[PDB]
């Protein structure tokens with residue numbers, strides 16, 4: 001229903017777009033500055049390609065949020081909305097997050113996790129354009145794709161967490177809190193939204209998801225950058 | 241025309257979705273169990289990333305068929321159909337099949353084959369939403385992309401078939417029968433469907449394509465897994 | 481407005497489709513013929529995978545232009561148009577061009593350039609389906625993604641241009657003229673088109689963009705092939 005506070009939504013999207021993009025520019029700037037937590041001009045001179053994935057997602061999320069803000073400023077309903085089809089932008093970003101996490105931790109089965117999230121979001125996308133009882137059918141299919149992905153990622157994370165130093169474990173623990181404390185919240189909001197239970201209104205749904213992207217995209221990326229800085233120095237500069 | 245036996249279509253799609261997904265879960269389970277046909281815990285401990293492509297496609301095809309079954313149970317015409325736009329799901333799966341086949345056989349020019357199938361399917365997708373004489377124009381363009389792909393894949397397969405042991409050649413021969421015995425059947429069904437000649441009705445078109453996916457996705461994957469098991473043991477455990 | 485000379489557009493698209501595809505088939509044929517500018521059957525026998533990206537784009541662009549010609553022959557407005565949504569085909573091709581350029585010159589930060597062009601085009605796609613003042617908002621966002629990509633590519637190109645031999649520098653200089661002489665023309669045409677200033681009519685817009693694809697896709701690819709031939713021989717056969 002076209003009765004929500006659209007200018008508030010645009011302002012919220014504009015504010016987070018600046019925050020996510022600014023964080024992404026920092027980590028990209030920080031990455032090429034030096035390998036270790038202090039500084040290192042690289043042995044070969046150039047940073048690894050996969051290490052920049054965290055920064056690009058924030059800019060990708062920032063660009064996605066910039067388009068969202070333009071949609072809300074125009075009152076919504078624009079031909080290029082990125083808000084009419086929910087989770088559609090997340091299809092481009094969320095699979096890259098776990099891919100970045102896999103590369104950072106060297107977790108095997110990266111391609112399996114990649115398609116797990118990619119198909120998990122796609123089932124979620126199909127689970128609201130269907131105004132029938134099968135809306136939860138796609139929701140169930142997504143959970144069937146996410147639960148064995150939520151699991152088997154806790155295994156590998158838990159197995160490798162005991163190897164890293166406590167200094168590196170610090171951020172890694174916080175990243176896992178971001179990982180396994182806020183990603184499972186996305187299905188819960190879907191149940192309680194107007195699509196399911198109805199506790200969350202449409203206006204609140206955009207706002208809370210706007211707030212549940214700095215932690216998932218920006219702050220999680222920031223932790224990954226710092227954790228990489230601790231990882232890089234400890235492994236290379238500290239030689240451990 | 242909305243007069244076909246939709247509940248039959250949903251039941252057929254549901255049955256094959258269970259079969260394709262179950263086969264995919266097996267080969268993923270079988271892969272991490274052990275390298276050789278018997279068992280091997282890997283030298284490095286982790287399976288190669290590209291070896292899991294066969295399993296993911298079946299789950300990808302199973303998830304795609306699960307969405308098809310939901311569409312047919314709801315009587316069709318759902319906003320997220322995956323049946324209104326034919327071959328659209330195949331765009332996500334078919335290029336990965338040859339990519340898996342290329343990696344299994346180490347066939348060069350993988351990227352060329354990948355884009356060959358990717359553009360071949362896309363031309364097929366555009367060749368039914370066009371209710372005019374240009375429907376066959378996109379069909380001709382797809383064949384122009386597929387015939388030099390159907391060829392030059394027979395070359396490389398034939399050249400390498402003489403190298404493998406007869407034990408491995410067994411499955412490889414059967415895979416090539418699946419490869420070069422059923423993929424060329426997709427264009428033929430298009431000609432004889434209501435889009436072209438009209439011999440095949442709309443109801444029969446979904447059913448036969450539902451039956452022509454276990455062989456292409458599941459059974460072909462199963463052969464690839466067993467052929468890999470024979471390849472892996474013969475090369476590593478048997479040292480040949 | 482449906483008043484432009486559609487058969488002229490189809491003829492122009494058909495002519496360039498033959499030219500782009502024919503050039504792509506040549507460079508693919510030339511690549512496997514031999515490494516050096518003269519001939520070399522490869523040390524391992526097979527060409528590098530990334531070296532074929534230039535040829536595939538031309539065939540990809542040729543196939544895309546073949547679909548454009550079919551759309552214009554049918555009078556336009558076909559369900560599968562590739563002309564109703566501008567720059568949508570460029571999303572599939574343009575990111576691969578810089579990726580090929582990055583691999584040819586071994587320029588680092590390939591993934592950063594890839595997403596830069598990928599998001600630059602996407603902002604352009606959203607910048608005409610929006611019939612409001614926010615059409616230039618997406619345009620500004622695209623320029624914000626392209627200007628730091630147009631820059632930092634001049635740096636790396638300029639830094640490495642002094643290393644190559646003058647024989648190789650010749651084509652590289654011409655490629656950079658194609659690169660940094662015609663890519664910035666795409667935003668300029670958008671400003672002066674009926675979407676912006678209005679100097680360029682709709683009929684002229686397709687024609688000039690049809691002419692501004694041989695240089696970007698075919699001729700640029702041809703230069704890349706010859707530059708690779710000079711690079712390959714000089715580095716391998718000439719041992720320099």
Ligand SMILES: CCCCCCCC/C=C/CCCCCCCC(=O)OC[C@H](COP(=O)(O)OCCN)OC(=O)CCCCCCC/C=C/CCCCCCCC
Nearest residue numbers: 063064067077078079080081082084565602603605606609
């Ligand atoms: C900007 C950086 C982005 C980076 C990455 C982008 C990748 C993600 C791709 C996003 C796809 C966007 C699809 C959005 C479609 C929105 C449809 C929509 O809003 O419809 C509702 C709206 C009804 O609302 P009103 O008329 O206001 O009703 C109130 C009565 N006065 O309908 C319309 O406005 C009609 C829509 C016009 C056609 C839609 C065109 C969508 C743009 C196409 C480009 C995307 C390409 C997708 C590829 C496949 C080709 C379809």
Ligand SMILES: CCCCCCCC/C=C/CCCCCCCC(=O)OC[C@H](COP(=O)(O)OCCN)OC(=O)CCCCCCC/C=C/CCCCCCCC
Nearest residue numbers: 085122123125126129303304307317318319320321322324
């Ligand atoms: C689930 C796992 C999937 C994994 C991988 C997925 C990748 C493949 C992507 C699939 C894209 C799906 C597009 C399907 C569109 C279907 C359109 C359709 O059915 O229209 C017909 C139907 C007419 O039928 P009835 O009204 O019953 O007529 C009888 C009269 N009583 O029309 C409708 O229902 C209207 C359709 C509503 C809008 C369609 C929204 C499609 C969903 C968008 C999400 C997909 C994103 C695509 C990206 C580009 C953005 C467009």
Ligand SMILES: CCCCCCCC/C=C/CCCCCCCC(=O)OC[C@H](COP(=O)(O)OCCN)OC(=O)CCCCCCC/C=C/CCCCCCCC
Nearest residue numbers: 325362363365366369543544547557558559560561562564
């Ligand atoms: C061929 C090789 C291609 C290789 C790579 C391809 C990748 C790029 C994908 C291209 C997506 C194509 C989308 C084009 C949509 C065009 C819509 C259009 O033309 O609408 C205008 C036109 C109005 O014109 P007329 O009725 O003539 O008006 C005058 C009055 N007599 O409207 C129509 O014709 C209705 C359109 C029917 C539905 C459109 C179906 C588009 C085809 C879907 C396949 C693409 C899949 C996209 C994935 C997401 C799923 C949506």
Ligand SMILES: CCCCCCCC/C=C\CCCCCCCC(=O)OC[C@H](COP(=O)(O)OCCN)OC(=O)CCCCCCC/C=C/CCCCCCCC
Nearest residue numbers: 109112116144145147148149151152257261272302303306
């Ligand atoms: C037709 C219906 C739709 C078809 C598909 C529906 C869902 C498919 C089920 C899951 C598909 C694959 C999940 C992808 C992400 C998980 C990644 C993965 O499997 O990694 C492999 C990993 C094993 O790796 P190893 O090599 O032992 O690790 C040591 C490191 N060397 O697999 C596992 O951990 C086993 C699978 C997950 C374990 C969790 C156990 C409990 C799962 C809850 C069940 C939920 C319902 C799903 C039903 C089927 C589940 C198998």
Ligand SMILES: CCCCCCCC/C=C\CCCCCCCC(=O)OC[C@H](COP(=O)(O)OCCN)OC(=O)CCCCCCC/C=C/CCCCCCCC
Nearest residue numbers: 349352356384385387388389391392497501512542543546
């Ligand atoms: C504007 C119109 C649309 C534009 C494009 C239309 C179709 C384009 C034509 C084909 C494009 C490329 C096909 C992609 C899949 C084929 C892969 C490929 O070319 O592999 C290279 C491979 C050569 O590899 P070598 O290195 O010798 O192998 C030894 C291993 N070291 O190429 C070939 O085998 C030659 C091409 C295929 C051989 C088949 C011969 C007969 C083909 C039937 C012609 C059908 C019409 C198509 C017209 C143009 C065809 C060239």
Ligand SMILES: CCCCCCCC/C=C\CCCCCCCC(=O)OC[C@H](COP(=O)(O)OCCN)OC(=O)CCCCCCC/C=C/CCCCCCCC
Nearest residue numbers: 017021032062063066589592596624625627628629631632
């Ligand atoms: C919410 C709004 C939307 C969010 C995002 C909007 C645009 C984001 C800004 C740019 C994002 C990244 C651009 C991607 C392509 C550029 C590739 C890149 O950054 O390469 C790194 C490269 C540094 O590499 P080194 O390792 O030093 O090179 C030596 C080789 N070893 O970065 C740079 O060169 C610095 C950035 C570009 C330099 C150009 C300086 C002037 C730029 C004009 C500003 C235009 C406005 C954009 C605002 C923010 C720009 C930072």
Ligand SMILES: CCCCCCCC/C=C\CCCCCCCC(=O)O[C@H](COC(=O)CCCCCCC/C=C/CCCCCCCC)COP(=O)(O)OCCN
Nearest residue numbers: 015016018019020021022023024026037214219222223226
């Ligand atoms: C519940 C409140 C939530 C508040 C929202 C969060 C606001 C952002 C602030 C940071 C959030 C995450 C930070 C994670 C922890 C890292 C901080 C830190 O201490 O990092 C250092 C160093 O690493 C860093 O520098 C990381 C911190 C830099 C973060 C910069 C903030 C994001 C950048 C955005 C700038 C542009 C934003 C535009 C303006 C916003 C307009 C709305 C690591 O070492 P220490 O443990 O201090 O040990 C000291 C000896 N080594």
Ligand SMILES: CCCCCCCC/C=C\CCCCCCCC(=O)O[C@H](COC(=O)CCCCCCC/C=C/CCCCCCCC)COP(=O)(O)OCCN
Nearest residue numbers: 255256258259260261262263264266277454459462463466
């Ligand atoms: C014309 C009739 C078609 C029937 C449809 C096919 C039904 C599926 C049965 C298998 C089809 C393909 C099998 C390919 C041949 C492999 C069988 C085989 O023998 O494999 C072994 C070992 O490899 C295997 O174990 C592969 C076979 C396992 C296949 C399991 C079937 C698919 C899994 C689906 C389970 C879940 C399905 C859900 C229920 C369905 C509800 C509708 C290889 O060694 P042998 O030659 O026996 O040599 C012995 C000494 N080494």
Ligand SMILES: CCCCCCCC/C=C\CCCCCCCC(=O)O[C@H](COC(=O)CCCCCCC/C=C/CCCCCCCC)COP(=O)(O)OCCN
Nearest residue numbers: 495496498499500501502503504506517694699702703706
């Ligand atoms: C302003 C006028 C623009 C005209 C449009 C362009 C027409 C195409 C002609 C070539 C354009 C770019 C060529 C770039 C320069 C390379 C030419 C060249 O000399 O290459 C050689 C060798 O490399 C080549 O062979 C590259 C040239 C081959 C290009 C073939 C033209 C494109 C192929 C299309 C064929 C099918 C087209 C279908 C018909 C069209 C119907 C409309 C490199 O060595 P040289 O400097 O001669 O030194 C000699 C000792 N080594």
Ligand SMILES: CC(C)CCC[C@@H](C)[C@H]1CC[C@H]2[C@@H]3CC=C4C[C@@H](O)CC[C@]4(C)[C@H]3CC[C@]12C
Nearest residue numbers: 157158159161162173176177178179180181182
């Ligand atoms: C309320 C929400 C946000 C947070 C609740 C999630 C908490 C309880 C979860 C998130 C991440 C999880 C941690 C992930 C990794 C490890 C490392 C392992 O070696 C011991 C368990 C431990 C330490 C987990 C304990 C539980 C944990 C801390």
Ligand SMILES: CC(C)CCC[C@@H](C)[C@H]1CC[C@H]2[C@@H]3CC=C4C[C@@H](O)CC[C@]4(C)[C@H]3CC[C@]12C
Nearest residue numbers: 397398399401402413416417418419420421422
């Ligand atoms: C009716 C349909 C399903 C099957 C017809 C396809 C048969 C005839 C095709 C499919 C795969 C083909 C095989 C593919 C590979 C080889 C290996 C080569 O060294 C000799 C030829 C040989 C053995 C081919 C013979 C023809 C073949 C068996």
Ligand SMILES: CC(C)CCC[C@@H](C)[C@H]1CC[C@H]2[C@@H]3CC=C4C[C@@H](O)CC[C@]4(C)[C@H]3CC[C@]12C
Nearest residue numbers: 414417418447448449450451452453454455459
């Ligand atoms: C109805 C149409 C579209 C397809 C149905 C035919 C499929 C399901 C059938 C036809 C002939 C069958 C093949 C016949 C014999 C064997 C030998 C066995 O050791 C492996 C499977 C394999 C290779 C079968 C796979 C399934 C198969 C290909």
Ligand SMILES: CC(C)CCC[C@@H](C)[C@H]1CC[C@H]2[C@@H]3CC=C4C[C@@H](O)CC[C@]4(C)[C@H]3CC[C@]12C
Nearest residue numbers: 637638639641642653656657658659660661662
């Ligand atoms: C009118 C349009 C088409 C062409 C104008 C663009 C010209 C002026 C641009 C395009 C490519 C550019 C070149 C790109 C690379 C180098 C190598 C460097 O070591 C010196 C500068 C030099 C030589 C640049 C000079 C300016 C240049 C030649």
Ligand SMILES: *C\C=C(C)/C=C/C=C(C)/C=C/C1=C(C)CCCC1(C)C
Nearest residue numbers: 090094124139142143146186187190
């Ligand atoms: C914005 C970025 C992230 C990582 C978003 C992630 C979202 C989820 C993992 C959502 C999952 C869903 C599942 C499990 C099944 C039902 C539908 C959802 C889309 C909510």
Ligand SMILES: *C\C=C(C)/C=C/C=C(C)/C=C/C1=C(C)CCCC1(C)C
Nearest residue numbers: 330334364379382383386426427430
């Ligand atoms: C489900 C998986 C597979 C591998 C499907 C493959 C389909 C084809 C190769 C279809 C090809 C077509 C071509 C050659 C040109 C006309 C249109 C078709 C889509 C039928």
Ligand SMILES: *C\C=C(C)/C=C/C=C(C)/C=C/C1=C(C)CCCC1(C)C
Nearest residue numbers: 570574604619622623626666667670
């Ligand atoms: C056909 C191939 C190429 C490489 C096309 C490239 C097009 C551009 C770089 C277009 C860029 C745009 C930007 C900078 C922002 C506004 C919108 C444009 C799409 C014109």
